[PDB]
Structure 1
């Protein structure tokens, strides 16, 4: 796998609360240099990222209700539709973990479905961050099933803000659960080329990476 085609798996990510305009521009510069799939940012930076990436193949994408996944669904929808309208091409939402752990599958479903409807109405795609760190293995499986039922296009491992991120065995469990019907995005704590390749081998079809420069050089 060449650096160019590895880059195509990567949503180059910068989500730190203290990222400055200069920090965000550098992330954009890096993504354009390596031609990654996307630049992934918090919704405030979407207009700027869109401007920076204009005329390139790199897509701006946004997280929403992130990283806690406990934002009211209607407010998540507003954040998502605004982000898409301002240039986002994909939306990575966060699972309502508390409702899943509490066994309220119908509420978990309603939450994702509202985002899926809004995102798909604009012709874009939706990823659901499971936050595997906070889930039992059975819950990881259930979260994938509900994500699929609600119409999500991808399941994504982690926000990068919990106690751990992408794990080879979790990625494999996710890929087994969704089969080839949804994408699987390994994210969080991916620090080396070897780790990136292992996630792809475990079944990831996309990756969230912030240490992208170190991995591609």
Structure 2
């Protein structure tokens, strides 16, 4: 059971390092770790300034198709569209393949549904022009309430999110199976399973955890649905756990 799930999960990872003090050496090591004896991860996820060195490293190890994701409006999800859009434009200029933007979840909690639409839509228009995929982090662990998780997911989808993502990994509570079910049910209910992927991020630690998340996807959308365009794990230590489950 865990061998099959761990293979699938490894090739869906956005292998991540997002620390206040990351270095080129740490990003280089991360790129090397993304090329495993059983597969490449789907992507790496790093701060924008590291995109050039990561791209070089990925090319020089012969894995040019590992995608490079980054983050914007991060981790705060503030409601200043000009700043979020400037950061998204800078991430595109740094060379990102994918931008994971934080939704203005505290503004939503205060009753403003419109700013989240306008922020996501502006970032989507910049990314789409550059053929860059946009993921939207709603911060389920701070929204807390099921109705709010559903609403943030719905606004993000309406505004053009290519993925909805649970969490930044920078707050106390990140992905859970409960939150994942709620968000994937929104994808289902809105009829967007073909065009909107799901990404649990933070707190996915073990091969057993990953197997749970994939079981929800398979139940809701069928076993064929999850793939790199539709599913990612935002994770780090998970990779060593998946490799261990696979005998490496």
Q: TM-score range by the shorter chain?
A: over 0.9
**Is 2:84 aligned against 1:76?**
yes
Structure number with greater CO (CA < 8 Å, separation at least 6) is 2
Query: Which of 192, 195, 199 pairs up with 2:206?
Result: 192
* SS of alignment partner, residue 39 of structure 1: strand
CA distance, structure 2, for counterparts of residue 21 and residue 119 of structure 1: 25
Aligned-residue Cα RMSD (Å) equals: 1.6
The alignment of Structure 1 onto Structure 2 pairs a total of residues equal to 217
Q: How big is the shift at 1:23?
A: 1.3
Deviation (angstroms), 1:164 = 1.0
Moved more, 139-148 or 193-202: 193-202
CA distance in 1, matches of 2:96, 2:243: 24
* 1:16 aligns with one of 12, 16, 19: 19
Q: 1:210 aligns with which of 236, 240, 243?
A: 236
Partner of 1:49: 54
User: So what's the TM-score if we normalise by structure 2?
Assistant: 0.82
Q: Does 1:153 align with 2:153?
A: no
Return 5+ residue gaps in structure 1 as ranges.
Answer: none
Match status 1:85 vs 2:93 = yes
Using a 3 Å threshold, how does the CA distance of structure 1 residues 213 and 39 change in structure 2: closer, same or farther? same
Structure 1 length-normalised TM: 0.94
Q: How big is each residue's C-alpha offset from its partner over 1:18-46, in whole Å with a ceiling of 9 and x where there is no partner?
A: 22221111111101234100000111211
Gaps of 5+ in 2: 218-225
* In 1: Cα distance, 2:159 partner to 2:240 partner: 35
Give the deviation of 1:106 after TM superposition.
Answer: 0.9
